Design an enzyme around this catalytic site. Structure first.
Site, PDB file in Angstrom:
ATOM      1  CE  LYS A  29      -3.853   2.347   2.251  1.00  0.00           C
ATOM      2  NZ  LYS A  29      -4.838   2.331   3.370  1.00  0.00           N
TER       3      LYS A  29
ATOM      4  NE  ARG B 137      -3.030   0.731  -3.757  1.00  0.00           N
ATOM      5  CZ  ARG B 137      -3.929   1.544  -3.207  1.00  0.00           C
ATOM      6  NH1 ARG B 137      -4.444   2.552  -3.886  1.00  0.00           N
ATOM      7  NH2 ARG B 137      -4.313   1.342  -1.951  1.00  0.00           N
TER       8      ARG B 137
ATOM      9  CG  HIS C 209       3.124   7.343  -0.168  1.00  0.00           C
ATOM     10  ND1 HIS C 209       2.492   8.569  -0.207  1.00  0.00           N
ATOM     11  CD2 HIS C 209       2.517   6.641   0.818  1.00  0.00           C
ATOM     12  CE1 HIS C 209       1.542   8.605   0.710  1.00  0.00           C
ATOM     13  NE2 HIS C 209       1.533   7.446   1.344  1.00  0.00           N
TER      14      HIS C 209
ATOM     15  CE  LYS D 125      -4.038   9.064   0.533  1.00  0.00           C
ATOM     16  NZ  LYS D 125      -2.824   9.917   0.404  1.00  0.00           N
ATOM     17  N   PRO D 126      -7.562  13.680  -0.610  1.00  0.00           N
ATOM     18  CG  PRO D 126      -8.699  14.545   1.236  1.00  0.00           C
ATOM     19  CD  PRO D 126      -8.183  13.264   0.666  1.00  0.00           C
ATOM     20  CB  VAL D 127      -3.093  15.421   1.423  1.00  0.00           C
ATOM     21  CG1 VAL D 127      -1.712  16.060   1.360  1.00  0.00           C
ATOM     22  CG2 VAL D 127      -4.110  16.440   1.918  1.00  0.00           C
TER      23      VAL D 127
ATOM     24  CB  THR E  86       3.833  13.112  -0.780  1.00  0.00           C
ATOM     25  OG1 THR E  86       3.088  14.121  -0.088  1.00  0.00           O
ATOM     26  CG2 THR E  86       5.171  13.677  -1.244  1.00  0.00           C
TER      27      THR E  86
ATOM     28  CE  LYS F 152       2.445  16.018   9.774  1.00  0.00           C
ATOM     29  NZ  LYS F 152       2.069  15.935   8.335  1.00  0.00           N
TER      30      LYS F 152
ATOM     31  NE  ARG G 230      -2.297  20.367   0.578  1.00  0.00           N
ATOM     32  CZ  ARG G 230      -2.713  19.753   1.682  1.00  0.00           C
ATOM     33  NH1 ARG G 230      -3.970  19.789   2.073  1.00  0.00           N
ATOM     34  NH2 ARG G 230      -1.852  19.096   2.421  1.00  0.00           N
TER      35      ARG G 230
ATOM     36  CG  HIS H 246       1.364   6.333   7.523  1.00  0.00           C
ATOM     37  ND1 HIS H 246       1.267   7.710   7.513  1.00  0.00           N
ATOM     38  CD2 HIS H 246       0.102   5.865   7.659  1.00  0.00           C
ATOM     39  CE1 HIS H 246       0.002   8.061   7.650  1.00  0.00           C
ATOM     40  NE2 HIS H 246      -0.726   6.961   7.746  1.00  0.00           N
ATOM     41  CG  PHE H 247       4.971  10.378   2.637  1.00  0.00           C
ATOM     42  CD1 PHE H 247       4.656  11.682   2.925  1.00  0.00           C
ATOM     43  CD2 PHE H 247       6.176  10.102   2.068  1.00  0.00           C
ATOM     44  CE1 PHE H 247       5.527  12.693   2.626  1.00  0.00           C
ATOM     45  CE2 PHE H 247       7.052  11.110   1.764  1.00  0.00           C
ATOM     46  CZ  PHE H 247       6.724  12.410   2.039  1.00  0.00           C
ATOM     47  CG  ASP H 248       3.898  11.394   9.838  1.00  0.00           C
ATOM     48  OD1 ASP H 248       2.888  10.668   9.940  1.00  0.00           O
ATOM     49  OD2 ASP H 248       4.159  12.195  10.768  1.00  0.00           O
TER      50      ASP H 248
END
Length: 124
Positions: free
Chosen positions: A7, A10, A12, A41-43, A45, A66, A85, A119-121
């Site tokens: 995931k 896919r 990032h 998906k709003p955001v 990278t 975060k 974005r 996860h991309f933070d």
């Protein structure tokens, strides 16, 4: 179902292009990585490096996520990235994105054995 590592790959990873050349790069990539399927998906990278480079970040600078957990890692060096974005005039199913190309440090949450990005933070 999909593993957290795949995931992250896919959502990032985009190693096969060194940088986003087009203003529409996010419109294309958010659609083909299945990130506008049921919702925009709003955001998001995308990272333009090899998988071994991005996975090496999990042995680099340990920092707080975060959410308050310290399973995050900040890359020691900058990386070629593209931030996506959702714009103000974006309405599903016609999702519209601003593409921002940049060379920035990334922060990813790492997990599992093998210890890999799930996860991309953020990017700093």
């Amino acid at each position: 179902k999909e593993t957290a590592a795949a995931k992250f790959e896919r959502q990032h990873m985009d190693s096969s292009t060194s940088a986003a050349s087009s203003s529409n790069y996010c419109n294309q990539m958010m659609k083909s990585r299945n990130l506008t399927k049921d919702r925009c998906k709003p955001v998001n990278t995308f990272v333009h490096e090899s998988l071994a480079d991005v996975q090496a970040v999990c042995s680099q600078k340990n920092v707080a996520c975060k959410n308050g957990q310290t399973k995050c890692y900040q890359s020691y060096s900058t990386m070629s990235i593209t931030a996506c974005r959702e714009t103000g005039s974006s309405k599903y199913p016609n999702c519209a994105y601003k593409t921002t190309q940049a060379n920035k440090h990334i922060i990813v949450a790492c997990e599992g054995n093998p210890y890999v990005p799930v996860h991309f933070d953020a990017s700093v």
